[model samples]
Target: GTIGLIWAQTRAGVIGADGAIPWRLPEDQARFKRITMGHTVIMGRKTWESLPGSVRPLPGRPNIVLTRDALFEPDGALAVGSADAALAASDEAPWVIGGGEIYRLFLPLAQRCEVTVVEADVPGDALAPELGEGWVVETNDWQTSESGLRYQFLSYRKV
Candidate 1:
């Protein structure tokens, strides 16, 4: 079976939400960086294009991109035809970073949903589909920031 992991600080990875990424949580950013360091990350075509320059291949992980268009392949990413192809390529669980299209496609199959629930009311585009947990609330710590945006680390998974 295949699985997905995701993260979106404020806009929940939605460009149309606020027109930009917001309140990138320190802990969340670290977690995203640390956890995804050497793993396979799956994203769609638009998400691939949206990334700014210097794509680092997620450190130790293979950056797997899903694009029907076939023209957006960057230097370090492996191109796939569809979500199915991404699954076929990733022999184990892969993280699905988004731009809406991918989230909708992979949400139901997500084995883990790790989010930094920014308390500031984003009311933007959309957030990851609500879920109970693959595990317990494991850790729900409130980290304060100068921005005054209330955010917490909310992680869930499927059993």
Candidate 2:
């Protein structure tokens, strides 16, 4: 199964601030849902916890929460102790829906990356991985959000 990394980042690569996303774009949210709806989603404990309770397990996908805590278990999600375990637990192509460290762990293993590049210069502690020279953009569709934020949907493949 293909391994993919999916995330939304600011112009400076900021992904999260204070354990939450700093900006809101409904279109981006819809895009994410459309992209990963049927695939298994792998995420760190922080990322799993940051999701709203109503959408905790993220409907229509198998959710794998990566963590070291043996007792850390949440309803409607599988908790795994390692990246290998997370991969083993999933059957279909798995998408890493991150926190900073989880993205770092899966970056080299991922075959593709689906990113939403927001135009704002937002402050964040967590960041998206740098694609650098090893990856190439397969597609980039830029558009303005209803809220007036300029953003682009980018698909990158390992080169």
Candidate 3:
């Protein structure tokens, strides 16, 4: 209940074929890096497994993981065993980083969604969370990338 949910929105939410994130939309990755550098993050186990196996935890922030399987443990990650465990363990504001499952899990509790709508597009199975009811777009910064991908960085707050 204390996390700020953040995501990158593209037609296909998956990383590109070259393993590059598809956010050709302005400083999407930069903004997320800066923000998460200051806040701890909680992501799903599958998302954790998707990272380079050799990669260590981020230098400054704690990367907590949410998973139902208790035996699961990733190097450099603090396994919280459950979403509730993660919230109880975090002292600072947490960011629910995602690979989909995490996004779906936190949809009900997320207060604000920081979404960067990417320019270049692809077709895929993943999706951006559907906003409705109390959700309202609060701010948007639109830009077209040097490659001519038109997108916007938008923030939505729950009403």
Candidate 4:
């Protein structure tokens, strides 16, 4: 499977606030679903807990959590000892979902990224990983939301 990572982040690369996403962008959520629906999604424990009880283990996909707790058994989700083990057990390529550490750990292994560029100034302690050089944009489409927020869908491939 082709390894990929995806997220909706602000200009400052803020992906989470406290324990959840700081903003609401339907388009971004839809885009995320479209890309990850059929694939395995790997996330850290915090990211898994960020979901509400009703939708904790996102439906229509395999949710894998990477944690240190040997006994951490998240309901409806698979628990792995480490990030490497999670990758080894997933489909050829699994989508690396995030909290912060998960993204940072998988950054070196990702071959592509689907980024939702939300235009805002929300601040958060959880920071998104930087996409360094060698990544070229494969697609960039700016769109406006119903609430008048500007955002873009960006697909980048490792060069």
C-alpha lDDT of all candidate models, in order: 0.68, 0.92, 0.72, 0.88
Q: Per-residue CA lDDT of candidate 3, range 1-159, in tens?
A: 356888887744553333335445546657888878957888877667666555446557788888888887777778877777888887568898885767888888888888877756575455667777997885566686676777777788888
Off by over 4 Å in 4: none
Cα-based TM-score, every candidate: 0.79, 0.96, 0.81, 0.95
* 10-88 per-residue lDDT for model 1 (tens digits): 5343333543454455656677778776668887766676666665455567888887767765678898888788888
Model 1 misses residue 125 by how many Å?
A: 3.2
RMSD of each: 3.1, 1.1, 3.0, 1.2
By how many angstroms RMSD does model 2 differ from the true structure? 1.1
Error of 2 at 106 (Å): 0.6
Candidates, ranked, TM-score? 2, 4, 3, 1
Q: Stretches of candidate 1 above 4 Å error?
A: 9-19, 132-139, 146-148
* Candidate 3: Cα lDDT at 51: 61
What clash count goes with each model? 6, 0, 0, 2
Highest lDDT against the true fold, candidate: 2
The prediction achieving the highest TM-score against the true structure is 2
Prediction 4 TM-score vs. true? 0.95
Give lDDT for model 3: 0.72
Error at 61, model 1, angstroms: 1.8
